[PDB]
Design a protein around this motif. Structure first.
Motif, short mmCIF file in Angstrom:
data_model
loop_
_atom_site.label_atom_id
_atom_site.label_comp_id
_atom_site.label_asym_id
_atom_site.label_seq_id
_atom_site.Cartn_x
_atom_site.Cartn_y
_atom_site.Cartn_z
N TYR A 107 -6.28 -0.14 4.02
CA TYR A 107 -6.10 1.75 3.02
C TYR A 107 -6.93 1.79 1.78
O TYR A 107 -7.73 2.30 1.57
CB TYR A 107 -5.32 2.59 3.46
CG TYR A 107 -5.32 2.51 4.86
CD1 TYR A 107 -5.65 2.94 5.92
CD2 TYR A 107 -3.89 1.79 5.43
CE1 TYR A 107 -5.38 2.96 7.41
CE2 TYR A 107 -2.88 1.95 6.92
CZ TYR A 107 -4.05 2.58 7.85
OH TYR A 107 -3.35 2.63 8.76
N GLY A 112 -13.58 12.82 0.88
CA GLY A 112 -13.65 11.66 1.46
C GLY A 112 -11.77 11.70 1.30
O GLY A 112 -10.80 11.21 1.87
N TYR A 169 -8.38 -0.20 -0.18
CA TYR A 169 -9.50 -0.70 -1.09
C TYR A 169 -11.03 0.36 -1.17
O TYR A 169 -11.40 0.50 -2.15
CB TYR A 169 -10.26 -1.74 -0.42
CG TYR A 169 -11.88 -2.42 -1.12
CD1 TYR A 169 -11.87 -2.93 -2.18
CD2 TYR A 169 -13.06 -2.40 -0.03
CE1 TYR A 169 -13.06 -3.29 -2.38
CE2 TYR A 169 -14.18 -2.73 -0.57
CZ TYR A 169 -13.59 -3.15 -1.74
OH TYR A 169 -14.82 -3.65 -2.74
N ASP A 170 -10.53 0.97 0.14
CA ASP A 170 -11.60 1.81 0.65
C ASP A 170 -11.75 3.39 -0.40
O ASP A 170 -12.71 3.81 -1.18
CB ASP A 170 -12.02 2.18 1.62
CG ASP A 170 -12.59 1.37 2.63
OD1 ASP A 170 -13.80 0.76 2.87
OD2 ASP A 170 -11.76 0.60 3.62
N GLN A 171 -10.28 3.64 -0.50
CA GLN A 171 -10.12 4.53 -1.01
C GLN A 171 -9.76 4.43 -2.96
O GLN A 171 -10.85 5.61 -3.82
CB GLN A 171 -8.86 5.70 -0.82
CG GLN A 171 -8.43 5.86 0.47
CD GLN A 171 -9.82 6.53 1.24
OE1 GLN A 171 -10.63 7.66 0.59
NE2 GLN A 171 -10.24 6.18 2.37
N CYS A 172 -10.55 3.34 -3.33
CA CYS A 172 -10.16 2.80 -4.52
C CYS A 172 -12.24 2.90 -4.95
O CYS A 172 -11.87 3.16 -5.51
CB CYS A 172 -10.04 1.47 -4.67
SG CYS A 172 -8.02 1.70 -4.76
N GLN A 173 -12.89 2.29 -4.47
CA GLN A 173 -14.12 2.58 -4.11
C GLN A 173 -15.18 3.48 -4.27
O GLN A 173 -15.63 4.17 -5.08
CB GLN A 173 -15.26 1.53 -3.21
CG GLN A 173 -14.40 -0.07 -2.77
CD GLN A 173 -13.89 -0.88 -4.34
OE1 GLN A 173 -12.97 -1.30 -4.23
NE2 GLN A 173 -15.11 -0.44 -4.68
N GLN A 174 -14.54 4.79 -3.62
CA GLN A 174 -14.29 6.16 -3.84
C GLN A 174 -14.09 7.06 -5.71
O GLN A 174 -15.08 7.72 -6.05
CB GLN A 174 -13.95 6.97 -2.54
CG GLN A 174 -14.03 6.47 -1.13
CD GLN A 174 -13.99 7.56 -0.28
OE1 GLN A 174 -13.56 9.15 -0.49
NE2 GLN A 174 -13.62 6.86 1.37
N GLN A 200 -7.90 -5.17 -3.49
CA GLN A 200 -7.42 -5.20 -1.90
C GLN A 200 -6.47 -4.99 -1.43
O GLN A 200 -5.27 -6.17 -1.50
CB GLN A 200 -8.19 -7.07 -2.54
CG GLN A 200 -8.94 -6.90 -2.79
CD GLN A 200 -10.54 -6.77 -2.40
OE1 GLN A 200 -10.12 -6.19 -0.99
NE2 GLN A 200 -11.51 -6.13 -3.26
N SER A 214 0.70 -0.79 0.01
CA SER A 214 0.25 0.25 0.03
C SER A 214 0.93 1.36 0.33
O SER A 214 0.98 1.93 -0.57
CB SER A 214 -0.98 -0.06 0.95
OG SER A 214 -2.25 -0.78 1.15
N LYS A 221 -17.21 5.22 -7.75
CA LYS A 221 -17.67 5.30 -7.56
C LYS A 221 -17.92 7.17 -8.70
O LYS A 221 -19.28 8.15 -9.21
CB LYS A 221 -18.27 6.25 -6.07
CG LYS A 221 -17.88 7.75 -5.50
CD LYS A 221 -18.05 7.72 -4.12
CE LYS A 221 -16.89 8.57 -3.41
NZ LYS A 221 -16.76 7.55 -2.18
#
Ligand SMILES: C[C@@H]1C[C@H]2[C@@H]3CCC4=CC(=O)C=C[C@]4(C)[C@@]3(F)[C@@H](O)C[C@]2(C)[C@@]1(O)C(=O)CO
Lengths: 249, 12
Positions: free
Chosen positions: A110, A203, A112-117, A107, A28, A120
């Motif tokens: 830290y 975010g 995964y969450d920023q990547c989903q943002q 995967q 990461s 979107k």
């Protein structure tokens, strides 16, 4: 003869390569540092783009600096969204021709969450089937959509430029469809998307601010980006900036 | 002068 939209097409910078080294441990920290290096080079391109953007250099130099320092992440995330839309239909994060991140490479801690943002944002381009010219006009309006609560030094020039590119977004919408019947509906949808970008990017910015200030994580930032963040961050955390919204939010 | 200011002031 020459239209403002045709000029926006011509000044849009070419996409940069990352030069990422695939032989290194996928971690990461290494990935975030590689992305920031690419981001610093994209910000340099964006500054050159803004200099070429009709009307922008009529602003006071301190206002040019404020707008770029306040909006850089919105510009970068919006263009990442567009590349990911055109190149993968919003399924992968298309950072650069040599750096494409699919769902399973996401995967990561830290990450995964920023990547989903970030996905979107790309998914909104898919939902609305945004045209290139609508995207270019929207991108200008992101440069012009975050300002100090206390105002700018060349406020009259700013208000003129911003209104000019709001008008241009309207022209892009008309050019897209042919039945003008949906022109107001389309303008409503795209200005709602602009308003929503403030929350969608907020975010990402908070995460960037954390990785910047927390030297323990060992995330590297290049020099110009670090300078920009060091100026942007205290103004954002103090609540001294405001977004220019089209709708009641 | 920051790097950003230098770039904004550079001819181009
Ligand atoms: C989640 C945040 C948001 C990320 C940014 C999202 C927008 C962007 C698009 C690019 O095509 C290149 C880099 C950037 C500009 C970015 F990807 C990197 O800079 C890394 C970044 C700040 C981040 O990953 C970090 O804070 C890691 O430190």
């Amino acid at each position: 003869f020459p239209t403002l939209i045709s000029l926006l097409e011509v000044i849009e910078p070419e996409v940069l390569y990352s030069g990422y080294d695939s032989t290194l441990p996928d971690t990461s920290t290494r990935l975030m540092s590689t992305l920031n290096r690419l981001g610093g080079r994209q910000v340099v391109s964006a500054v050159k783009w803004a200099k070429a953007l009709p009307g922008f250099r009529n602003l006071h130099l301190d206002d040019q600096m404020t707008l770029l320092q306040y909006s850089w992440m919105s510009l970068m995330a919006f263009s990442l969204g567009w590349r990911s839309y055109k190149q993968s239909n919003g399924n992968m994060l298309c950072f650069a021709p040599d750096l494409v991140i699919n769902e399973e490479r996401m995967q990561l801690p830290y990450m995964y969450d920023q990547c989903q943002q970030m996905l979107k944002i790309s998914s909104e381009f898919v939902r609305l089937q945004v045209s290139y010219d609508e995207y270019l006009c929207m991108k200008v309006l992101l440069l012009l959509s975050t300002v100090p609560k206390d105002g700018l030094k060349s406020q009259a020039v700013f208000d003129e430029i911003r209104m000019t590119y709001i008008k241009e977004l309207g022209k892009a919408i008309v050019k897209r469809e042919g039945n003008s019947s949906q022109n107001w509906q389309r303008f409503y949808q795209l200005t709602k998307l602009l308003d929503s970008m403030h929350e969608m990017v907020g975010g990402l910015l908070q995460f960037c601010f954390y990785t910047f200030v927390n030297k323990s994580l060992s995330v590297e930032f290049p020099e110009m980006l670090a300078e920009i963040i060091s100026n942007q961050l205290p103004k954002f955390k103090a609540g001294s900036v405001k977004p220019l919204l089209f709708h009641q939010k | 002068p920051s790097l950003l200011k230098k770039l904004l002031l550079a001819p181009a």
